[PDB]
Amino acid sequence: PAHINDFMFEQQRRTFATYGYAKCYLPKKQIHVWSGHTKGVSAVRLFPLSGHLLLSCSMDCKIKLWEVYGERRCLRTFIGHSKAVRDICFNTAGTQFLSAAYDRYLKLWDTETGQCISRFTNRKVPYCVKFNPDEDKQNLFVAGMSDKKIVQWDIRSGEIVQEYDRHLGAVNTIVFVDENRRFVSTSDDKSLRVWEWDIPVDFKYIAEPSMHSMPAVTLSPNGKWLACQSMDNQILIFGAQNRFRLNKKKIFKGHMVAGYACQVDFSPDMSYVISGDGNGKLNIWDWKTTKLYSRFKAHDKVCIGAVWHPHETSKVITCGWDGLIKLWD
Amino acid sequence: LSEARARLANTQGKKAKRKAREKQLEEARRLAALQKRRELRAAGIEIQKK
RNA sequence: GUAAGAGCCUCCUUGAUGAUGUCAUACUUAUG
DSSP states (O other): OOOHHHHHHHHHHHHTTOOOOOOOOOOOEEEEOSSOOSSOEEEEEEOTTTSSEEEEEETTSOEEEEEOSSSOOOOEEEOOOSSOEEEEEEOSSSSEEEEEETTTEEOBEEOTTSSOOBOOOOSSOEEEEEOOOSSSOOOEEEEEETTSOEEEEEOTTSSOOEEEOSOSSOEEEEEEOTTSSOEEEEETTSOEEEEOOSSSSOOEEEOTTSSOSOSOOOOOTTSSEEEEEETTTEEEEEEOSSSSSOOOOEEEOOOOOOSSOOBEEEETTTTEEEEEOTTSEEEEEEOTTSSOOEEEEOOSSOEEEEOOOOSSSSOOBOEEESSOBEEEO | OHHHHHHHHTTTHHHHHHHHHHHHHHHHHHHHHHHHHHHHHHHOSOOOOO
16 A cells, blocks of 8 residues: 555646446038228128128228128228227117227217218227117117126217126126116126116126136027037037026037137027137037037138028028138028 | 035045136136237237236 | 235037926025
8 A cells, every 4th residue: 555645646636637657501602701801800790680781890990881792792981990999889770880999989880871970988998889679769888898897878868878897807798688687798707697787786697617708609599598609619508597597508519719709600590500710710510409510611810700691591601700701601 | 425425535625626716717717818818919919018 | 704815096530409387305694
């Protein structure tokens, strides 16, 4: 160590800047869907009364109006959606429609007029949108959102209808029955719960550790049974509820579930049920025989879902996938 | 007697029973959450992180 | 009757059915 007094002079020179160093039906593909979209199909809709007009919803956030059945070409284009449509809906007559947009914006759409209806919003991103059965007025629509409460919404009155929480899980989809006193509610909690709806109180809840999510939910046209395909690729047919049991049809396996919700299809001859597969193959099932039909691969991409013709006799079944849709005879 | 022998095979207990219900319920909740998450990630590119 | 936890402030597979309601009995409730 050096001297501290010398370090003081060295610091003083440093401040001075001194540098000195000194017998089953076999349907086949009929025709491709009208037009199409690059983005995956968001929802598959169709005209309930006519059946010829199909409304294709895609992830492109543009509602695609399609004319389909016969002389095959689409309908027109529909815009105005803020973000990708989470769900699609339509009125009983078909001239009016409802839209559920992942922007958390529910926008009704007029179709036959060439343009939509109006733009609306909700509290959270709606996970389900469905029209109200029974009374032909239906000022409210049965819907559901990430808030985990099935809520009907009155529209033409300027404000919604009511909100009711059946379960703590986010409602995946809601399909109201014909009795109008109960509406089947499937939620992300995996618990299938019917809900008394018009009354603020629900109905009942069942099967929380079963029926994984809600990949497919459907009911027979006769209303005797409602089957729901589950994300284990396990189709659980539930005998519909009026009873002490009030559930449980049968068990139908053989499908494929990749986790994406697939639109369930059937042939309502009292015969068949057909739905898409998670791998993209076309799932054909014989139903009333308690066993399926056959698995015929159709779409090259992940199958979004499928639809069926009206109920008269065997006719044809439409199909759709991600990025493209194909109808089968 | 049949329920007594089945209970003898059930000797795992309510702890292992709640562990089995938590494993099946956790696998179903992970299959549904990862399910819908995979359905959303395949369409839109906007997602948060875990 | 209650310690703890959770998140939102470019190519495949082995074919067994269903809807009309009531008693002894078993299990789950802080309403006696």
